[PDB]
Amino acid sequence: QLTYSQLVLRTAIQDQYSKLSGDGPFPMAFGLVLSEEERREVIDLYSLQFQYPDQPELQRLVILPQAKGSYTWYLRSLNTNEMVCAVTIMAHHYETHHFVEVPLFATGVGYKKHGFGRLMNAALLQWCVETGFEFVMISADVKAIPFWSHLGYKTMEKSELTRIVFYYEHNCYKFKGAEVMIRYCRTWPTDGVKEALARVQKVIVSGHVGLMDA
């Protein structure tokens, strides 16, 4: 409950009507959660996707930053001010091991299956590369596996996990019955963000096309 969790998805029927059914471009911007207002906006997005983490647990996971510790980034639709996609990470430096885990990742109602997840994941990996991180590791509930696998993550090999098993079991966020999955940053293509952004129709990004730390 501190370092253990269980993925319980909401089941309420969500309207899938595309929020980008409109015409011209939809301007959007990335951001880091730096205010209480941004914190609530992302918690609210996550809330509509998860039954567990529940409200108190989202409030615990989605925090203002302290290179290190917890960060939550989002993509904002500028015409509506709505949250489109968001990700919460924990950045770890343990011995020679510099890596990131991803406790939460969600795309909002009306925005699913448009390529926003791929785009946000690309921006994260780009940011991992640009900061000093070696790999991104995912605790994946059986229901998340297909998603992460489509984003190019793979089952972490037993020997690589045992390299950090003690630290992981005491410090990382672990979904009940999850498979541990990973992508090494050295394999992330330099054009990965550009190619994802190309695959999101009708969107133009304003400001830095990726994630920042302040």
Ligand X SMILES: CC(=O)SCCNC(=O)CCNC(=O)[C@H](O)C(C)(C)COP(=O)(O)OP(=O)(O)OC[C@H]1O[C@@H](n2cnc3c(N)ncnc32)[C@H](O)[C@@H]1OP(=O)(O)O
Stretch that binds ligand X, among 35-43, 65-73, 141-149, 158-166 (CB under 6 A): 141-149
Q: In the set 107, 123, 128, 136, which binds ligand X (CB under 6 A)?
A: 107
Stretch that binds ligand X, among 11-19, 147-155, 159-167, 178-186 (CB under 6 A): 147-155
Q: Is 90 in the site for ligand X (CB under 6 A)?
A: no
Q: How far is CA 61 from CA 5, 39, 57, 99, 166, in A?
A: 11, 10, 6, 18, 22
Token digits of residue 22 = 């409109």
The angle at the Cα of 105, spanning 199 to 8, to the nearest 5 degrees, equals 130
What's the burial of 122, exposed, middle or buried (CB within 10 Å: 0-12/13-18/19+)?
buried
Token digits of residue 183 = 């992508």
Total of residues contacting ligand X (CB under 6 A): 18
132 has binding-site annotation: no
Q: Is 77 in the site for ligand X (CB under 6 A)?
A: no
**Residues contributing to the annotated binding site for acetyl-CoA:** 105, 107, 112-113, 115, 117-118, 150, 199
Q: Residue numbers of the site for ligand X (CB under 6 A)?
A: 7, 49, 104-107, 112-118, 144, 146-147, 150-151
